[PDB]
Amino acid sequence: PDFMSFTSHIDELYESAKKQSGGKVADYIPQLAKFSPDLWGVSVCTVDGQRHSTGDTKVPFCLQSCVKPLKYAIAVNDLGTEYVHRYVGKEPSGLRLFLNEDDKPHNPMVNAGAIVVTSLIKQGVNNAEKFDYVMQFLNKMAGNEYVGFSNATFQSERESGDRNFAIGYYLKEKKCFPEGTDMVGILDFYFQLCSIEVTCESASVMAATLANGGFCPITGERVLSPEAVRNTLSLMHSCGMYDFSGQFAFHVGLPAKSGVAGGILLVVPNVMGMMCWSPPLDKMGNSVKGIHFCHDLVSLCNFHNYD
Amino acid sequence: PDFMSFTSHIDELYESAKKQSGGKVADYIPQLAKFSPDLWGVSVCTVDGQRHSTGDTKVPFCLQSCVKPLKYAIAVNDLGTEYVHRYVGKEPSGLRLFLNEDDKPHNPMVNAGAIVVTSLIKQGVNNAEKFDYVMQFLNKMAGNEYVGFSNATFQSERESGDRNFAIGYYLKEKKCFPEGTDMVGILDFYFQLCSIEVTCESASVMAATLANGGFCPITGERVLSPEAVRNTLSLMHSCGMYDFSGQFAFHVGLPAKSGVAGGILLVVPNVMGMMCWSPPLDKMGNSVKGIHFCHDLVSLCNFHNYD
Ligand SMILES: N[C@@H](CCC(=O)O)C(=O)O
Ligand SMILES: N[C@@H](CCC(=O)O)C(=O)O
């Protein structure tokens, strides 16, 4: 209704979350540990293309696990729900290395499922063409705003990702991949996808595309099928916030996805997309200021699923 | 928009689910095993008070686990979210006897959590007054339509409920109950609540009250607080369908609760309530015809959360 007055409220919510200085910046690679704890930005993009930013909204950071819903959406878009879910389940595990009763990863939002989803995208071409394909897809989702790549993050991520290699070999042993998959090459592609860089501004438009039925709000183009969008939102609602996913569903009731860079990709269906970013993470791996901001936003604006 | 034409579609969906003859009638007590497999009814009550029934909609059956959301709602209504959730968690387990990391039952929809919720209601009075209190509450939810009691079910349920006694003593040992709780008397009250009888017709109005923000649509009275209703819908969405809850959330995306009598209490927020009932259950414990009907209903009418 009144965007300028909604904007004032976002700025007050921003300002209250800012005083919240707890948490620890991820440090398992130097490219994460570098980041200032005081960095804090929130960008909004409505379903009608209205924009508002406050704080550090033009500083690039890596999507990390925030890319998981986006590549899941790409796979469902290209391949359909049924094909994708031959390989990956549709529900939460407890707690956030094992497979479900059908020897599938529990869902696309845990590393095992994201690694499997990565193996399904653009099969038969080399990694450079797979990567370019996804990069172009994210450009459409972002209405051609900032989408980059951190080579330093990619190289450290691959050198230090012992757990992800253990998962890969485990998935190989349980036959979780499509026929003819080079698992080690899939891990590389996965590491690369984690290392894609956005700003709060550009990521908010990606979230707005999900909020707007798969149409990008600042270009008007259909980027994702209705089915892709719907599946992605369902899984972001139940599985997007690591071991906090249940509590977030209860108290906030919006589809969101967090990552270790401190991003929270938030969708308010039929209203807007947002990206909140602040490096310091709580014990569950979620941005301290962004979790605070999300609780406040739903209280103020009555955006809960079952409001 | 056009109720009479919506009604025709419900009848076609009813008719298609009817041909679905799989499943097994529960038989762990004779009061369940008695029931014909061919019994099948669907009742709708809209948020504006419009009614439609098809099939066996006036044959009483026991709420069984369908009562779980209703007593959880009563407790939050009387005591608030914060008090109730000192005792019970807010999220799914995997798979559907243990407690969460805080030694609480995972949520109100598993037996352990429902037993704890039962211990919180109307504390300090005797069981007859507790029971009368809840019966009167269900009368308000149902707009004074059919609410009864099966004494035969209550007596068999208590004689044969070895698992529930094991849970009770386990909860007693982990200190899960409020101070001064008679655990064995709480189990009785729990058995009694399972044995409350409704028809599809009367249960649909209970569901419509949840669909309508806690106001009963055929009387207009406020029965439940906004908070009670919202909490209940969140937990029905994630935890209401036993081990099928994840898949139901994905494919159907509505708050529902199933029970072993073959009932499915379904809420379509801001639109309507329904009760589907058919005794024969699938391997997960859900009504075969009602699961089929629910999938079909969401396909036809676009009622999914993230449609
Ligand atoms: N690259 C990290 C992603 C961590 C995250 O964003 O949670 C991993 O694969 O473990
Ligand atoms: N009285 C049954 C309820 C079963 C159900 O409806 O799932 C029990 O407590 O196990």
Side-chain angles (χ1 to χ4, degrees), chain A residues 1-178 180-307, chain B residues 1-178 180-307:
Chain A
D2 183 16
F3 190 65
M4 214 149 259
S5 171
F6 173 67
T7 264
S8 293
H9 287 125
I10 290 295
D11 294 342
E12 292 176 0
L13 293 184
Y14 175 88
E15 218 66 48
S16 154
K18 193 185 210 253
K19 300 174 205 143
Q20 224 54 50
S21 69
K24 174 174 148 25
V25 179
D27 63 2
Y28 68 87
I29 55 167
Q31 290 69 39
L32 286 160
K34 270 175 163 36
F35 275 86
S36 177
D38 303 314
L39 291 158
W40 172 223
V42 173
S43 295
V44 172
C45 182
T46 72
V47 141
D48 302 298
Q50 303 150 119
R51 313 293 299 276
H52 182 78
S53 288
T54 308
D56 308 302
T57 62
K58 287 175 155 59
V59 182
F61 60 90
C62 292
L63 283 167
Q64 289 289 353
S65 283
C66 298
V67 74
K68 286 181 187 192
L70 304 177
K71 68 190 163 180
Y72 169 74
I74 293 174
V76 172
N77 182 80
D78 295 353
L79 303 164
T81 300
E82 195 268 322
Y83 178 87
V84 172
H85 287 288
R86 292 178 195 167
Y87 298 97
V88 68
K90 18 197 149 165
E91 55 192 286
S93 48
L95 280 166
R96 221 102 231 157
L97 163 54
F98 72 141
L99 297 166
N100 73 10
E101 272 201 303
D102 318 344
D103 284 330
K104 298 175 195 180
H106 288 93
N107 61 79
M109 306 307 163
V110 301
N111 291 6
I115 291 165
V116 172
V117 169
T118 307
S119 82
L120 306 184
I121 291 164
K122 210 71 176 172
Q123 294 167 63
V125 296
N126 62 33
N127 267 9
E129 298 184 334
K130 289 177 177 173
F131 184 80
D132 289 336
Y133 179 72
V134 173
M135 283 294 263
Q136 271 92 267
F137 224 125
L138 297 176
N139 292 334
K140 283 190 93 192
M141 285 178 202
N144 300 305
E145 297 194 0
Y146 196 106
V147 185
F149 180 69
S150 176
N151 179 58
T153 302
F154 163 54
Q155 303 295 331
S156 304
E157 207 54 74
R158 158 216 250 176
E159 275 177 319
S160 80
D162 298 308
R163 196 180 163 249
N164 285 318
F165 276 90
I167 293 172
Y169 277 108
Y170 188 78
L171 292 171
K172 192 173 168 198
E173 207 254 349
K174 299 296 192 172
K175 305 297 192 193
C176 294
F177 293 117
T181 284
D182 170 22
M183 177 274 291
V184 165
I186 290 307
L187 284 179
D188 267 353
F189 183 30
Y190 173 84
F191 295 140
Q192 284 167 8
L193 289 170
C194 291
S195 306
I196 295 174
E197 283 197 322
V198 292
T199 60
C200 289
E201 269 159 34
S202 71
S204 74
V205 183
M206 293 181 187
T209 296
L210 297 173
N212 193 38
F215 287 86
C216 176
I218 66 170
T219 64
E221 291 178 6
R222 198 192 293 262
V223 185
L224 294 161
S225 69
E227 175 196 355
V229 175
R230 191 186 98 161
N231 289 7
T232 304
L233 297 183
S234 296
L235 297 172
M236 280 168 78
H237 176 100
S238 51
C239 304
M241 304 296 289
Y242 308 110
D243 294 343
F244 200 67
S245 306
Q247 291 193 254
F248 191 93
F250 191 82
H251 292 282
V252 181
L254 285 172
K257 185 73 195 88
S258 68
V260 75
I264 304 176
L265 198 71
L266 188 75
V267 180
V268 188
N270 308 305
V271 182
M272 65 180 205
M274 305 191 55
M275 175 65 97
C276 301
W277 171 68
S278 189
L281 311 176
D282 65 27
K283 267 53 169 312
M284 313 262 76
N286 303 307
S287 182
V288 170
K289 297 188 193 97
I291 288 297
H292 186 90
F293 179 91
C294 284
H295 278 84
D296 268 16
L297 176 75
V298 163
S299 295
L300 186 59
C301 295
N302 302 317
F303 284 151
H304 199 284
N305 206 209
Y306 296 119
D307 280 340
Chain B
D2 183 16
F3 190 65
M4 214 149 259
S5 171
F6 173 67
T7 264
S8 293
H9 287 125
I10 290 295
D11 294 342
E12 292 176 0
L13 293 184
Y14 175 88
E15 218 66 48
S16 154
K18 193 185 210 253
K19 300 174 205 143
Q20 224 54 50
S21 69
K24 174 174 148 25
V25 179
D27 63 2
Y28 68 87
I29 55 167
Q31 290 69 39
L32 286 160
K34 270 175 163 36
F35 275 86
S36 177
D38 303 314
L39 291 158
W40 172 223
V42 173
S43 295
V44 172
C45 182
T46 72
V47 141
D48 302 298
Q50 303 150 119
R51 313 293 299 276
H52 182 78
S53 288
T54 308
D56 308 302
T57 62
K58 287 175 155 59
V59 182
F61 60 90
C62 292
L63 283 167
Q64 289 289 353
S65 283
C66 298
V67 74
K68 286 181 187 192
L70 304 177
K71 68 190 163 180
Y72 169 74
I74 293 174
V76 172
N77 182 80
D78 295 353
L79 303 164
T81 300
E82 195 268 322
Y83 178 87
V84 172
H85 287 288
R86 292 178 195 167
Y87 298 97
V88 68
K90 18 197 149 165
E91 55 192 286
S93 48
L95 280 166
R96 221 102 231 157
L97 163 54
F98 72 141
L99 297 166
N100 73 10
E101 272 201 303
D102 318 344
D103 284 330
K104 298 175 195 180
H106 288 93
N107 61 79
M109 306 307 163
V110 301
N111 291 6
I115 291 165
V116 172
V117 169
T118 307
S119 82
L120 306 184
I121 291 164
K122 210 71 176 172
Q123 294 167 63
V125 296
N126 62 33
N127 267 9
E129 298 184 334
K130 289 177 177 173
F131 184 80
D132 289 336
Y133 179 72
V134 173
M135 283 294 263
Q136 271 92 267
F137 224 125
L138 297 176
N139 292 334
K140 283 190 93 192
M141 285 178 202
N144 300 305
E145 297 194 0
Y146 196 106
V147 185
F149 180 69
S150 176
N151 179 58
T153 302
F154 163 54
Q155 303 295 331
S156 304
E157 207 54 74
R158 158 216 250 176
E159 275 177 319
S160 80
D162 298 308
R163 196 180 163 249
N164 285 318
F165 276 90
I167 293 172
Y169 277 108
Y170 188 78
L171 292 171
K172 192 173 168 198
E173 207 254 349
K174 299 296 192 172
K175 305 297 192 193
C176 294
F177 293 117
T181 284
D182 170 22
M183 177 274 291
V184 165
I186 290 307
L187 284 179
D188 267 353
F189 183 30
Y190 173 84
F191 295 140
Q192 284 167 8
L193 289 170
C194 291
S195 306
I196 295 174
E197 283 197 322
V198 292
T199 60
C200 289
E201 269 159 34
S202 71
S204 74
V205 183
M206 293 181 187
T209 296
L210 297 173
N212 193 38
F215 287 86
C216 176
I218 66 170
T219 64
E221 291 178 6
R222 198 192 293 262
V223 185
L224 294 161
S225 69
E227 175 196 355
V229 175
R230 191 186 98 161
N231 289 7
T232 304
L233 297 183
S234 296
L235 297 172
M236 280 168 78
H237 176 100
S238 51
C239 304
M241 304 296 289
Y242 308 110
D243 294 343
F244 200 67
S245 306
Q247 291 193 254
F248 191 93
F250 191 82
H251 292 282
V252 181
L254 285 172
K257 185 73 195 88
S258 68
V260 75
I264 304 176
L265 198 71
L266 188 75
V267 180
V268 188
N270 308 305
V271 182
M272 65 180 205
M274 305 191 55
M275 175 65 97
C276 301
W277 171 68
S278 189
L281 311 176
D282 65 27
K283 267 53 169 312
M284 313 262 76
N286 303 307
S287 182
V288 170
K289 297 188 193 97
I291 288 297
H292 186 90
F293 179 91
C294 284
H295 278 84
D296 268 16
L297 176 75
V298 163
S299 295
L300 186 59
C301 295
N302 302 317
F303 284 151
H304 199 284
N305 206 209
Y306 296 119
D307 280 340

